[PDB]
Amino acid sequence: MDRRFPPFSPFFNHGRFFDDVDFDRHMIRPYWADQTMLTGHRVGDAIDVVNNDQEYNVSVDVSQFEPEELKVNIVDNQLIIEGKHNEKTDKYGQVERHFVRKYNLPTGVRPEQIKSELSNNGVLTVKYEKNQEQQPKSIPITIVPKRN
Amino acid sequence: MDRRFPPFSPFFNHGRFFDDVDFDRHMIRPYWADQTMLTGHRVGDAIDVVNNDQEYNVSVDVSQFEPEELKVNIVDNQLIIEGKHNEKTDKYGQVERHFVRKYNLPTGVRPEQIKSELSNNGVLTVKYEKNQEQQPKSIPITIVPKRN
Amino acid sequence: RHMIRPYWADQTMLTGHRVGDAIDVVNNDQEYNVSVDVSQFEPEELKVNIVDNQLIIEGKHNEKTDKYGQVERHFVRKYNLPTGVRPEQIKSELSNNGVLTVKYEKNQEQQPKSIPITIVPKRN
Amino acid sequence: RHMIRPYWADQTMLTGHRVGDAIDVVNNDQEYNVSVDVSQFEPEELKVNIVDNQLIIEGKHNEKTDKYGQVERHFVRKYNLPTGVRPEQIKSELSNNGVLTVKYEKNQEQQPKSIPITIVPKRN
Amino acid sequence: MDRRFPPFSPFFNHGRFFDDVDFDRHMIRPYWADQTMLTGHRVGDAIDVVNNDQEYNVSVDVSQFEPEELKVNIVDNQLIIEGKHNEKTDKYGQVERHFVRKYNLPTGVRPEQIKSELSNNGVLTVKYEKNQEQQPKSIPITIVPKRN
Amino acid sequence: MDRRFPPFSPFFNHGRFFDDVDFDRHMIRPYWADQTMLTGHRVGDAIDVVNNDQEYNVSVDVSQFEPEELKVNIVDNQLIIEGKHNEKTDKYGQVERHFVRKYNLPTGVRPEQIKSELSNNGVLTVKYEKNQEQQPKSIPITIVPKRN
Amino acid sequence: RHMIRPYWADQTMLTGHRVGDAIDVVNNDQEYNVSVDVSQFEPEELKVNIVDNQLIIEGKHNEKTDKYGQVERHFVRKYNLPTGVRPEQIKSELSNNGVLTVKYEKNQEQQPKSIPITIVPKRN
Amino acid sequence: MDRRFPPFSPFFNHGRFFDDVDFDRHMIRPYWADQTMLTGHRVGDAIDVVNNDQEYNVSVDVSQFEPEELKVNIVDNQLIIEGKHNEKTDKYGQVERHFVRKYNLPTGVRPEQIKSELSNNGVLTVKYEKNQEQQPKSIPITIVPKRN
Amino acid sequence: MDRRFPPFSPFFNHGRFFDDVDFDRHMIRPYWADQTMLTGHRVGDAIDVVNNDQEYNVSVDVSQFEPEELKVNIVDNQLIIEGKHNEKTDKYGQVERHFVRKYNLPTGVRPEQIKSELSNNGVLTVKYEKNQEQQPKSIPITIVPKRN
């Protein structure tokens, strides 16, 4: 995924129906064999930490870790984003990376409406809106994954 | 899926093992090329809103949107079900549809035990039981998706 | 039209209908007709525009409130204009049954002057 | 022409020929010529019409009686008009050898005013 | 048929058994894509009309029409041979041809023994023998068509 | 034949030349496996019997029998149309049908010019023109069947 | 431009460049722009013509002599004109950096009069 | 040639024997579809003109023309290198290029021993040695071209 | 080559890239199996001998011999064009042909600038320009043959 024309469905001119439709887990494939490179090409990992009276948005570059290798937990009033991947063999050699992050949390932040999104280039953004609207009510619905 | 005999596993007589087992994301495929048609054949979108002293069940017809295009959020004490899909090309032309819904919420409704289900025909039902039992305790377990 | 508003106890609307319903399109060298069912939008809430030689059909109405929860309809339908279509004079009709018909007769009813009969008809 | 009538003892006609004989069609961006052999039909029996932006060539004559059995010729030939063809001024020629030539020069002899030389030629 | 070596069975050296044995309906195939051409190369359509005291033979060139497009009927003491074909698309364009023929009939001609034959080159000959022999008796037998 | 797009040549977009060109004997194929159905969808079998001073046309619905199973004979001044087919196995079971018809004949009807035609939907029409023109002369010509 | 002439001891020219260098062409229903790098030809030595509804770009200069051996540049570049392109008003621009931009905006900014609102809008 | 790994034999790891061994006429193939580019990446066309008492070497960049499109002739005491190619269609459009060169010749230069070579990158070098050795004698031998 | 559409590259619509690109050595292939024929269809072999004060052009029809079978040498002030081919087997039989030519040479003709060309139809033309310009200088460059 995100490597050529036949990935990245439905933008797939070689049939458009069933040939090369797959999940986005193959985003790191171009970087799997690429070693002399940076954190998926951005400056730093945590792009910004916005903490004001109207929003709370934090953007993290996670292009070097697959979404399966990325997990977020909250331990003792700290926003912890930790991503560990096994040793990966490339055209150059073998590399294992591991990062642990912790972030303080402002008072009055409700975690029941915090939404986190991953962009195509490999940036995970955690967005929160301050205490002006919304209620802790949440009604989820079934979402069918896009296999092929 | 839900289009012929070889979809809808395990009801698949042409091998029964590994040939045509796929996720339910292809439910809208018969309606993908069908335009002169209705909201997946039901009367209206929201089938019913049950609000009594024993249950709270709301059924919504979502047959015109894929489960990936359906998302539910709660904003300022309102049950909001919003589903947006990109323009879809069929045998007739191009159509883009978008619906936004909001619903008031009765007092004393706990969102921690509200369960939403999607039926085969494309109906999303949000069910809630009144304040007589259950506790906010929830113990989830890993569920492996059914790919093939 | 105005039947979106009575959504109380009538969450299935008065008439079941989905945004972006159309009947048929006839495309040939004689005519170009586009019939669209717009029964769920008021006459003043229907907008049709042609941008970059392409027909755009959009129907949107204000969110109609009721006892339980307000409902809104909004869709954008796009039809490609074939070659020779002149947006400056595209015909349009809205029947009383909620069907909007967009026609185009190509204005090709001219009598052919070129009638070779005897010798060197030429041109003009 | 008039040689269809002498069919007595001459069932093979004076000149063997089949309805719908043509020589060549030249289709390019400069000209559009259609040459058709119409030697078996009288000049007043040849009709050429353009319907729905398409060229129609039809040749029919009255059944020419003779000693044994009358003979008639009737055919309808259809040629599609390419893009940019204007039926209102389509050229046509009928040579003396029974060949009908339908021409179209596209009227594209205009001099291009857009001659960029020094700076910001723009338009008009 | 009548276009190359592999047609025209049994004169078919590439197997001789079952490969390219077909009916003679493909006689016009060489002329299907050939437009700048004549009535299948003969002078005129009706080759000759023989009307004497011993025979009645009329030969008609029907090479421009398939045998399926050729039909013969008798209307009001006239031998009518009419052949109409739909518009045919070739390498040059589209052509539709139609011919109607009528022929007077000598007195004393019995139609019960008139035989019409089609030659390979596309000539239909109607042969009749004068009133000297034969009887109106006719005993037909089953003829199996030669498919392959 | 008369079942999908690849039958019914030359209306055959998948090659247009030699792939799926076949005789019209497969007209009953859609009804071969269809049992809960009518006489090929018309009201009755004999559509009409026209008997006037200018024409004699009789239309018979024969959609339930193949043309090979349909045969017409005249016995003792009666127009007899009889069609018998063997037992046919479908998705439902086994059925054998047989019909025998007889029709009186008006005086002065010449059988030498009576033409019978079968339409695509399976209707056999017997047409006759009254005694005002035509002669018993008939000149047949060879017609090549359309195999492929 | 005039830097072709100093070819003495400078056989690699002042700026390396090949005849027929262009930047980008944008082809859509809104605009048709053709940008060509013509830095190696003088403004008076650049000729652009449209023949048979097709854009021709040619750049040729006189052979520029020097101490050792004269050098000349001559090329003919051909661009096909898409459908709807009017050569009589084709835009053209020549930037100061030796880039010649040939534009075409399609003149499709007309306001669509066909606005169906209530009943039988028809045409005109 | 000079585009990937399987060209440029014998440096061809995918078999090494007979698969992708071809002549060097495909040197311009990478530049065939490349238009926004320079004279095969060098500064100018004629790299240098060496004219001294010991050698006469002139290097010309001919990377934009195939060796078949390059021809050298001498007209009236001038070294003329002229290369014309037909219009070439690329991913961008159509381009036709033509160059004519003329070069003066020092006195005492014998053309019988002048050797011209083409390098891999597309540079044609004309080398001459001054009047100190060699004789006009030349004994050529048969050279078999390397096809595959 | 010069026999159908798939030869004569790049005029090759069936792929245009690598399928049927070959050298022009197959020019005689149509005449290889053709015997009842002439010297590749021209009148005579030597078309003309131009000998004036401005040019010296001689055109020879060599369509009956392959370029490999054609060799030109000069022996004792005579232009000799000799072409010998082995016995060739065709649909008719076996034929061996051999021709020897000699031509006188005008005084003052420099052979260092004489150019000979072979046309597509099989005509070899030897062209010479009189003593008004050019010098015996000749600078050749490498030309890659066009294999495929």
Author numbering:
A (entry chain A), B (entry chain A), E (entry chain A), F (entry chain A), H (entry chain A), I (entry chain A): 1 to 148
C (entry chain B), D (entry chain B), G (entry chain B): 1 to 124
Publication excerpt:
Small Heat shock proteins (sHsps) are a family of molecular chaperones that bind nonnative proteins in an ATP-independent manner. Caenorhabditis elegans encodes 16 different sHsps, among them Hsp17, which is evolutionarily distinct from other sHsps in the nematode. The primary structure of sHsps shows a conserved organization with three functional segments: the α-crystallin domain (ACD) which is surrounded by the highly flexible N-terminal region (NTR) and a short C-terminal region (CTR). Consistent with its presence under nonstress conditions, and in contrast to many other sHsps, we determined that Hsp17 is a mono-disperse, permanently active chaperone in vitro, which interacts with hundreds of different C. elegans proteins under physiological conditions.
To address the basis for the special chaperone mechanism of Hsp17, we solved the structure of the Hsp17 wt 24-mer by cryo-EM. The oligomer has a cubic shape with the symmetry of a regular tetrahedron. The edges of the cube are represented by ACD dimers resulting in a 24-mer structure. In line with findings on other sHsps, the overall resolution of the EM reconstitution is 6.49 Å with the different parts of Hsp17 differing in resolution. Thus, in contrast to previous results, our reconstruction shows that Hsp17 adopts the metazoan ACD dimer interface. The NTRs of the surface-facing monomers are oriented to the outside of the oligomer and are partly unresolved, whereas the NTRs of the inward-facing monomers protrude towards the inside of the oligomer and interact with each other. In both types, the link between the monomers is established by the binding of the I-x-I motif of the CTR into the pocket formed by the β4 and β8 strands of the ACD of a neighboring monomer. We were able to generate a pseudo-atomic model of the Hsp17 24-mer consisting of residues 25 to 148 for the surface monomer and residues 1 to 148 for the inward-facing monomer. Hsp17’s unique trait is based on the specific arrangement of the NTRs which functionally separates them into two groups: those involved in formation and stabilization of the 24-mer in the inside of the cube and those accessible for substrate on its outside.
